[PDB]
Structures are given as C-alpha cells and as structure tokens.
C-alpha cells in the first residue's frame, strides 16, 4: 500500500510515513549534508508524510526517520543494516559507483559461513565469518585467503552487513576483476566471543587479538578450508582500529602476508624502525594505504607514509574524498580486492 | 544518560522505556498480550515507561508505536525478522526458555549460508545448514534433519524466529539430542533466497527439488550419513504439507517425520482418497521409525490435524501426537523443535 523508498528514474527518492497522530517526522540519511541537514517530511491532509530528495548519486544510502523525537525505521523497507547497536534502513541507487553492492540474481554466489573456533590465546571460543567463492563446494580447488578486519564498534558481521562484502566479492569475482579467494572476517574485540546482537558478553587485552589471529585463526582456516598457504596467498586489511591491527600483525610477522591494506588509519622507536626494515625485506607484493582527505586520521596516515618513506619502503597510497565512513571502506575493499594475489 | 530497555527484573517483570519530550503517546505491542496493546506512562522529564508481568519464561517479541508510527526499541540490540516484519525480543530466563539462550559455556555449531544449483527449479537458491559443534577438524559423519518453514518464511526463519542454532547447540551439548546436520531450505519455489537479502527472480517444485537437488547437494558437500535411518524431516504449516508430500512420494527415504501445525493435504474426492490411502499404505510399510504430529489445540488447523490422525488410525498407521496449548505461533514451533530433535536417530 505504501512504497518507501520509491526510487525514481532520475534518481530522486521518495519516502513516506503514515500517521494522523504525529506532529513532526524527519529523515536522517547519508545523502544529507550533516546533522544540520536533517530533512522534514511534509504532512498532507490524509495523514501521509512524504519527502522527495535528490537526484542522488549512485551509492548505498542508509537512513531512518524520527517521529516526534523517537527514532523509527521504515516499516515498508525490508532492507535493514546493523552497525553495532545502530540499526538503519538502506537502499542502493543504481549506477556505475554502486553496481558492485547489489545482490544480483545472474551472478554465482559464494557461501558465508558463521564458524566458531577455539582460541588458545584469548581463552574462549570465538565466532568469525568466512566467505568462500562461488563454486567452492563440489570441487577440490584451493584458494588464497584475505583476512579482513573491522574497527572499533564493529564485529565479525560488520564487513558483510555494513560493507556489502559478499556482494562486492561475488561481483568482482564473477566479473573476473578479483581472483576467487576466501575472505575471513574476524571479531577484532578480544573481550568478545562474537557479535553483540547474537552473543552475550563473556563471563570473567592489549595485543591478544593480533596474537590470536596469527596463532589461532590462520591455522584454523588453513586446516578447515581449502586454503592455499604462504605469504603470496595471504592478504590482510583493516579499517581504523583494524588497520592498526593489520600493522601490528604484519610488523610482528614479516613474511606472513604479502598483500597488506591499511584503511583510514595511520601510525600507532628503534623497534619500529627495525620492524620496518624486516618487513621491507620480506618479499611483500603490495602495501596499500587508503584514507579520506576529510578523515580526522589524515595527518596520522601521512605520518605513516612518511615513516615508510624514511626507510624507502614502497607502498601505494589512495587518497579519497570524504571521511571515516563505510562508504569509503566499501570503495577501498572494491579497489583492494582486485589487486590481490597478482604479481607485477 | 543510558536508558535500559527492556529491563528484566528479578521477579520476571519487564520494564520498557522510550525517551522523547516531544512525543504524545507511546504504546507497546508484545507477545504476552491477549490479542491487548498497552500504553506507556510519560513522566515530566520525557521518559515513557511501562512495567509488565511477571511473565512466564519464554522468548517474547514486541515493538512500540509512537504517535501512530511503529518503532523498535533503539536500546534493545535483539531484533528478529519474520518475513518483512521486524520486532525486538527478549528472553525471560527459566526452565521453559533455557534452550533458547546463546550460552557462552556451550560449544557452538556453524551456520552456513550456501547456494546450490537446482535442476528442478532452474536457478540457484540459498539454504542455511547447521553443523554440530566440532564438525570442523574431525572426520565423523552425521545424520541429517531437513527442517522446513511455512508460508511467509524463508531459509533464515528457523534460525532467526525459531532459535534453531541455540536449541540445537544446547540440546547437543547437554547430550539430549545426537549431533546432527540441520538443513533449512527456502520453501518458496519462486524465490532464490530470503527477501531481505535476495531480490525476486525474473506446483510440487519445492518438494521435487528437495529430493532431487537439496539432498544430493548436502550428501556431496557435507559429511552426512545417509539412508532413511539417518534422515529426518519436519516442517510447520505449509512446510508440514511439504513434509507429507515429500515422504508420501518417497516412501522409505525418511525414518523420522514431523508434521507441525498441519493436517490433511488438499479429480473427484474419491480418487483423491484412493491415492491418499495408497500413499499411507506404502508409507506404513516403509520401515519408518517415528511419525510425530504436533499441534496447538487453538490452531485453526486443529480439526484438519484431527482428520489426519483419524485417517492414520483407520489404516493402523502408528504415529505419536503431541497436543499443545496455544495456536499457530513460533512459540509452539520452537517447543516442537525442542521436543522432536531429542527423538531423532535413536
């Protein structure tokens, strides 16, 4: 009866909320300028509030309403994402920039496995999500592995939920742009066993997540999945806190990962310089640093680049528009995954 | 200031809270109500609240309505999805709900969201597969339980609405059910997967595809024991119909059969009864071990399930009937899974 959102042929979008009781309904969405750019829906004499925005550029946009001061989702939009405790609706405006984010019915789909594993380092069993490429099942081929790490507030569900990882990977692999690969999405919060929407706090520290990834996660993946081994078949990337984890893991384990991505994160000694020298000599194939110009971490990411320059350590830097957002992290995944497990 | 909602109190009363100085009226709709919406009381500082109960141990879903608009509880991370209907939930601890909790001291089985080709339906489809804790890293094979949803559901429903992963983890860890693989299909042959994740695609097909496409895929790609004594099937409503069709059309393929909240299955009337009788007789002689019919006394389908039981009696076909309180609800379907899984493969 009520279509919301209704995406129009010019990429305007109409949202609708029914209530004869409500005084004020606003919408907060990712196309807006900022908090001051919250938009008010217009009420008509039938009780229907509506607003049309845009045209919007192709992207995935999250939103919610506020009804007389209370957050409310769009009950007519089945698309709902979760960022920690923050649920929002979303929609995807079609076009070049968003095409990888769609779940396409004409594309083979990889499995997403929610698997538990023992952790010698952390001391209790934990959950991770593992993506395997389409056609993994029923064959004997083995695949390289990409460890993909979230930031503070996230969990092992975030990269698929917020980051559209299954769609991005299904589409990149089907398009021949990225090699078929296993993608391992850990919970980076060493005090947690799994995502807070499903797993309660553990009844009862520094470096433990990083140590456990190397000592617990990697061996479990290589034992229980058809994984190629060795540095040239391992990639690791992470955003913010997880980009710090990525640095710590690779700095402490030179020669374990040949493809390294640091998203929206910068620097965290004689030990630091020694570890850069060892990593420099480790035969790595790609060190990729991506950051938005407007991110608060920008200067720290420059410091990271300068610290690597000091050692004549080769990296590739991708500066993007915008800031510390899942929109940027989706873009970074989309660009980094095609680089992996290739030589040149 | 942090707002706790729901706040489950030591006496199993529950307090719900919604903050807004600008809202006029907030009500709550919840599964403890008899058909029964309740109004929260606004204090002078903008906090709306209500305390309900005490509530019996169970999982309860709810939502608010704020000035005529549905609103979830932004302070409750627990959210379930029933098709297109999202609601919050909470679980009152106690004997009757204990299997529904995700417990940190319990080994946890994997949930795999896997796609497979369907020769019968003609496009790839998604299912959820639960494997028991410790499946990874060992060579043991496991019996297989196919668990089917009803109209409006999808392959996510039995885990999301039905708490299947928790029920199975807890039953298996307690030694009450055997370790087993649980296969949760999408029973809507026009869909490729659940509508919250998968767009619409450009009868008897579901049932034929389960036998010809799903079962071979499971047996090829998981460490499954095979043959009827290692194979169970159950379903609710439409899926209990699927269960009957599949087993009646493949006598001797399943030894454990569960029909939840479903009765007789819908050519002259006599011809239908002749084919029904022949299917009963073949299934009667098939060597099955358990035919378990469970239904709420207040379900619309109660009389049709009685008709089914009476027809089986006329054929001296042995079944077990579990009548429960209540009606056509996920609360009952969780109970039925909880009671049926311990019976399997024994």
Q: How far is CA B311 from CA B264, B304, B305, B306, B321, in A?
A: 9, 11, 10, 9, 13
Closest CB from A73, A200, A224 relative to B102: A200
Can you give the three-state secondary structure of chain A, one letter per residue? CCCCCEECCCCCEEEEEECCCCCCEEEEECCCCCHHHCEECEECCCCEEEEEECCCCCEEEEEEEEECCEEECCCCCCCEEEECCEEEEEEEECCHHHHHHCCCCCCCCCEEEEEEECCCCCCCCEEEEEEECCCCCCCCCCECEEEEECCCCCCCCHHHHCCCHHHHHHHHHHCCCCCCCEEEECCCCCCCCCCCCCCCCCCCCCCHHHHHHHHHHHHHHHHHCCECCCHHHEEEEEECHHHHHHHHHHHHCCCCCCEEEEECCCCCCHHHHHHHHHHHCCCCCEEEEEEECCCCCHHHHHHHHHHHHHCCCCCEEEEECCCCCHHHHHHHHHHHHHHCCCCC
**Together in a domain, B67 and B104:** no
Coil, strand or helix: which one is B330? Answer: helix
Quote the minimal CA–CA distance from B226 to chain A in Å.
18
Q: Chain A: residue nearest B114 by CA?
A: A111
**Together in a domain, B301 and B171:** yes
Residue B101 is classified by DSSP as S
**Together in a domain, B141 and B269:** yes
**Together in a domain, B334 and B253:** yes
**Together in a domain, A70 and A209:** no
Residues of chain A in contact with residue B105, where contact means CB-CB under 8 angstroms, are 203
Closest CB from A21, A65, A117 relative to B24: A21
**Together in a domain, B31 and B137:** no
Q: How far is CA B172 from CA A194, A200, B109, B131, B164, in A?
A: 20, 20, 10, 11, 12
Alpha-carbon distance of A181 to A144, in angstroms, equals: 5
Domain-ending residue, one of B46, B74, B93? B93
Residues of chain A in contact with residue B67, where contact means CB-CB under 8 angstroms, are 19, 21-23, 67-68, 70
**Together in a domain, A332 and A209:** yes
Encoding tokens for residue B300?
């619309």
**Together in a domain, B206 and B271:** yes
B197-206 burial string, b = 16+ CB within 10 Å, else e? bbeeeeeeeb
**Percentage helix, strand, coil, to 5, in chain B?**
25, 25, 45
**Together in a domain, B190 and B259:** yes
Helices B238-249 and B269-284: crossing angle in degrees, nearest 10, is: 70
In chain B, beta strands by DSSP E: 7-8, 14-19, 26-30, 38-39, 41-42, 47-52, 58-66, 69-71, 79-82, 85-92, 110-116, 125-131, 144-148, 181-184, 231-236, 256-260, 290-296, 320-324
| Placement of tokens 């639960």 in the chain | B130
Alpha-carbon distance of A333 to A167, in angstroms, equals: 11
Domain limits at A61? 1-94
Quote the minimal CA–CA distance from A201 to chain B in Å.
8
User: Resolution (in Å) of the shown entry?
Assistant: 1.1
Domain count within chain A: 2
Quote the minimal CA–CA distance from B330 to chain A in Å.
18
Alpha-carbon distance of B99 to B109, in angstroms, equals: 14
**Together in a domain, B100 and B40:** no
Determined by which method? X-ray
**Together in a domain, A35 and A130:** no
Mutate to test the interface with A, among B8, B68, B102 (most CBs of A within 10 A): B68
Alpha-carbon distance of B22 to B41, in angstroms, equals: 14
**Together in a domain, A119 and A186:** yes
Domain-ending residue, one of A79, A94, A109? A94
Q: Chain B: residue nearest A72 by CA?
A: B71
The residues facing B244 across adjacent strands are: none
The residues facing A320 across adjacent strands are: A292
Quote the minimal CA–CA distance from B44 to chain A in Å.
16
Domain-ending residue, one of A53, A68, A94? A94
């Amino acid at each position: 009866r009520i279509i919301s959102p209704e995406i129009m042929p010019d990429n305007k979008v109409t949202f609708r909320v029914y209530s004869k009781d409500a005084s004020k309904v606003t919408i907060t969405g990712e196309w807006q300028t900022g908090p001051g750019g919250v938009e008010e829906l217009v009420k008509n004499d039938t009780g229907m509030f509506s607003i049309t925005v845009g045209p919007l550029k192709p992207e995935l946009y999250a939103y919610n309403f506020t009804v007389d001061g209370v957050k409310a989702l769009d009950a007519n939009n089945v698309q709902v994402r979760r960022d920690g405790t923050n649920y929002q609706n979303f929609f995807i405006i079609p076009g070049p920039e968003s095409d990888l984010y769609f779940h396409k019915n004409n594309v083979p789909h990889g499995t997403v496995t929610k698997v538990w594993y023992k952790s010698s380092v952390i001391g209790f069993d934990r959950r991770m999500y593992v993506y395997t490429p389409a056609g993994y099942e029923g064959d004997t081929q083995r695949y390289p592995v990409f460890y993909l790490l979230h930031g503070a507030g996230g969990d092992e569900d975030a990269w698929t939920n917020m980051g559209r990882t299954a769609q991005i990977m299904d589409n990149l692999i089907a398009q021949g742009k990225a090699k078929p690969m296993i993608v391992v999405m850990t919970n980076g919060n060493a005090n947690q066993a799994g995502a807070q929407n499903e797993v309660p706090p553990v009844p009862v520290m520094t470096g433990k997540f990083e140590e456990h990834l190397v000592k617990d996660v990697v061996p479990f993946i290589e034992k229980n999945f058809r994984a190629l081994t060795g540095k040239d078949n391992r990639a690791i990337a992470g955003l913010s806190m997880g980009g710090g984890h990525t640095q710590t893991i690779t700095n402490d384990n030179p020669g374990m990962f040949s493809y390294i991505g640091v998203f929206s994160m910068g620097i965290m000694e004689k030990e630091r310089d020694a570890k850069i020298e060892a990593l420099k000599k480790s035969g790595y194939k790609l060190y990729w640093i991506a950051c938005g110009k407007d991110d608060f971490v920008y200067q720290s990411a420059l410091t990271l680049r300068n610290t690597l320059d000091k050692h004549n350590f080769k990296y590739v830097y991708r500066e993007s528009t915008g800031g510390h957002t899942w929109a940027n992290w989706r873009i970074y995944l989309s660009e980094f995954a095609p680089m992996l497990f290739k030589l040149l």
